[PDB]
């Protein structure tokens, strides 16, 4: 077992024939990407559920296997800055009584120091041979839109083509979609750098039909970062699933920001070109849109806090703290889990996300009806040329009701449970009083 330790700690191999050691190997070992690396290993922490405590302890048997991965498989994918093929200075094994159990382990325990060094010499492959977290910034730039000039070029192209109509799914063709993705990527101005490579679209059950105002309210517009093997130890399927989830949820928020442009452009569109005639439906309706834009924009500022520094700024020190692959994977999983939990998207806060949909749909379906119409009844301080002005008013009353309902509802979660981001929310959205 001193030799078998060495084989798996100073080599990456394991001399075994009878199962005399608890290690294993698989057909997974012979392409060894992805989950297949998450499968090559050892059968349990023990053999069945017992172990020779004098050497494998049932304790540090894990950290043994951490360096086991670090020494076996880093060179296996690609010869490595501390191993070459296997030609770093050639391996050697290491490893009536007045200390009976007390210090058996203390003979073997300098192995754990070697392990801790191999561990410290595992972090660099991801920090530089990948530039992993520099790409996390790039991932935040593109997928989490902190490069707002990419994200607005994407929004401008995609939602200009979507606000042109094409309501029986007729925009969703591979070639136009790729052209806007590509074009948005060319217009990013950060450039298609090595970090800013690897970008692809996605969707599932591409809709042959759209709702009114063309929202894609079932958000089947998506973005993906193509993942390299050594990236794909720390990048992971559920992580990119949750990433594209928040991407699609913020992207429909960018569609509501685009709606914000469109409804304000409806003012500029006919410019109230009758310069000489002030209008009450102007002073009314151009203030109706003011609360709706103020509202969706304070929700925007709120969510921009909840992920892009409320959840990210802690991760900027949390990733710098750690020193293990599994800690790096786990800390990335913390960051993403808390991003879904704080950024409203979680299944537990979903009752409030339902009110968000109730607001969104109303603003979509009632300002499309403005977009396709002019400016109310003539007479007095007047606009002209739409009859449905009372329905534009009553839908704005329905919006206000759902904002009243929102305030009544959101208190409940922070009175029952414990979610500081929802206190933060209702502290903000009706800042000065019960409701304005």
């Amino acid at each position: 077992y001193t030799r078998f330790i060495h084989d798996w700690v100073y080599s990456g191999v394991f001399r075994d024939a009878y199962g005399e050691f608890m290690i294993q190997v698989n057909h997974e070992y012979l392409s060894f990407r992805d989950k297949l690396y998450w499968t090559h290993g050892y059968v349990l922490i023990s053999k069945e559920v017992e172990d020779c405590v004098p050497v494998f302890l049932k304790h540090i048997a894990h950290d043994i296997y951490v360096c086991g991965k670090t020494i076996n498989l880093l060179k296996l994918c690609c010869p490595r800055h501390y191993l070459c093929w296997s030609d770093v200075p050639v391996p050697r094994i290491s490893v009536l009584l007045t200390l009976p159990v007390l210090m058996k382990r203390s003979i073997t325990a300098p192995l754990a120091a070697h392990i801790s060094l191999v561990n410290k010499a595992a972090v660099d492959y991801f920090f530089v041979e990948l530039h992993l977290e520099a790409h996390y910034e790039a991932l935040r730039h593109f997928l989490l839109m902190e490069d707002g000039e990419f994200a607005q070029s994407l929004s401008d192209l995609l939602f200009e083509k979507l606000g042109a109509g094409q309501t029986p799914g007729e925009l969703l063709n591979p070639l136009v979609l790729n052209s806007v993705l590509s074009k948005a990527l060319q217009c990013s101005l950060h450039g298609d750098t090595p970090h800013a490579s690897n970008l692809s679209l996605a969707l599932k059950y591409l809709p042959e039909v759209f709702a009114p105002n063309a929202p894609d309210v079932l958000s089947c517009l998506e973005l993906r970062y193509k993942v390299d093997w050594p990236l794909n130890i720390v990048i992971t399927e559920g992580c990119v699933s949750k990433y594209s989830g928040v991407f699609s949820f913020l992207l429909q928020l960018k569609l509501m920001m685009w709606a914000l442009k469109d409804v304000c452009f409806h003012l500029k569109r006919t410019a109230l070109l009758s310069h000489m005639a002030g209008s009450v439906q102007f002073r009314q309706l151009q203030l109706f849109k003011h609360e709706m834009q103020h509202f969706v924009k304070v929700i925007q500022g709120y969510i921009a806090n909840q992920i892009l520094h409320v959840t990210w700024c802690e991760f900027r020190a949390r990733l710098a703290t750690v020193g293990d692959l599994e800690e790096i994977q786990r800390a990335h999983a913390e960051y993403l889990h808390k991003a879904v939990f704080r950024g409203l998207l979680t299944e537990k806060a979903a009752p409030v996300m339902n009110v968000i949909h109730s607001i969104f749909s109303l603003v979509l379906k009632f300002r499309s009806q403005l977009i396709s119409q002019a400016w109310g009844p003539p007479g007095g301080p007047r606009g002209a040329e739409h009859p449905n002005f009372a329905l534009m008013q009553q839908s704005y009353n329905t919006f206000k009701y759902y904002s009243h309902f929102l305030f009544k509802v959101v208190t409940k979660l922070v009175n029952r449970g414990y979610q500081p981001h929802l206190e933060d929310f209702l502290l903000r959205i009706n800042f000065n009083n019960y409701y304005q």
């Binding site: 070459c84 093929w85 296997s86 050639v90 063709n173 070639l175 790729n178």
Partner: protein
Amino acid sequence: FEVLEKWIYRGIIHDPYSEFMVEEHELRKERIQEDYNDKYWDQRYTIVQQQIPSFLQKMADKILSTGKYLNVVRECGHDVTCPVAKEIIYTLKERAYVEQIEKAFNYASKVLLDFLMEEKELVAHLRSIKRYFLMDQGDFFVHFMDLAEEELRKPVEDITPPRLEALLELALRMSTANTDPFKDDLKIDLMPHDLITQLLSGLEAFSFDYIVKWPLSLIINRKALTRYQMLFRHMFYCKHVERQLCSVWISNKQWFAGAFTLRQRMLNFVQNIQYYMMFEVMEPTWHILEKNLKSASNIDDVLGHHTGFLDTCLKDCMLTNPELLKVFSKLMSVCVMFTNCMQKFTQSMKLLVSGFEATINKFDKNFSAHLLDLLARLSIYSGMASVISRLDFNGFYTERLERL
């Protein structure tokens, strides 16, 4: 390992009892210059796959491909050698002495292409092919299909090759061959079996053969030079058919201008697709070819880079198309009539309000129907997508029978 050493650092096969992993046979005579089929891996030079150890088999292709670079240009005129020489011997749990193989392979690659790229220079020599195919030595070809045009143009055989063989000298010296005298590789070739080898006269009149001596023959070989020998012929007919249509336009520099406008319009269908076919991707493929080959240096990738480059240049030319774009071939049968029958009419109009006109309606919706469906037929792509984008561009007749 001493036998391996001789083969890795020199072009010498020591051959102990033929138990070493590489041996040489005299297959050289089967395909001496070009790799007409492969020779230098299993055949003339051969690897006995089981005679390699484990720690060397992981790169025994590079062992087999190191020494060849030291012993193919030794016959051609440079002493290709490795002054690096690191002795190979066993050691406990070590194979750094096999890690030396990469440096020696890359050095053999370096001295081989340090010949090939600049003595018998491929980066300047190879240009000859795509320069002379697809009429890119334009100052030759404008003279070529002009001085002897009257005995090249003819509808069914009836060329006189000796005339263009004298023009091949005058019109090349009159062109740019004065920039570099690289003419001798040009030889005329003609059809054994029509289209499919490519992978009427003036129409598709001829195409040009290409063979070279050994180090350039790593690059020029049968599977490639059959894309030489018989290509650009499916491009030559366009320039013939439009210039012959235009010779009708010479014979008249009443007069219902719809006929004149179709003469312009059907010609533009030739002219702008001819623009697309070759006046599209030009610089990039050369910029790629450099940074591909000049950095790599090693035939195991160099031939892949080159054969990739060759198809990349062709992918403008719808000469390369799996559907043969075959309605365009049917359209061609009336296109030639727009030349010959209307040349005949530019006598019989007195020997255009009538006998042109009675075919203008026919040519018009013969071309405009098939033209505005076949681009949609080729709607494959999501420098590319150029054939479709470039006759979408007009806006009227963007399509008439759509893909979607």
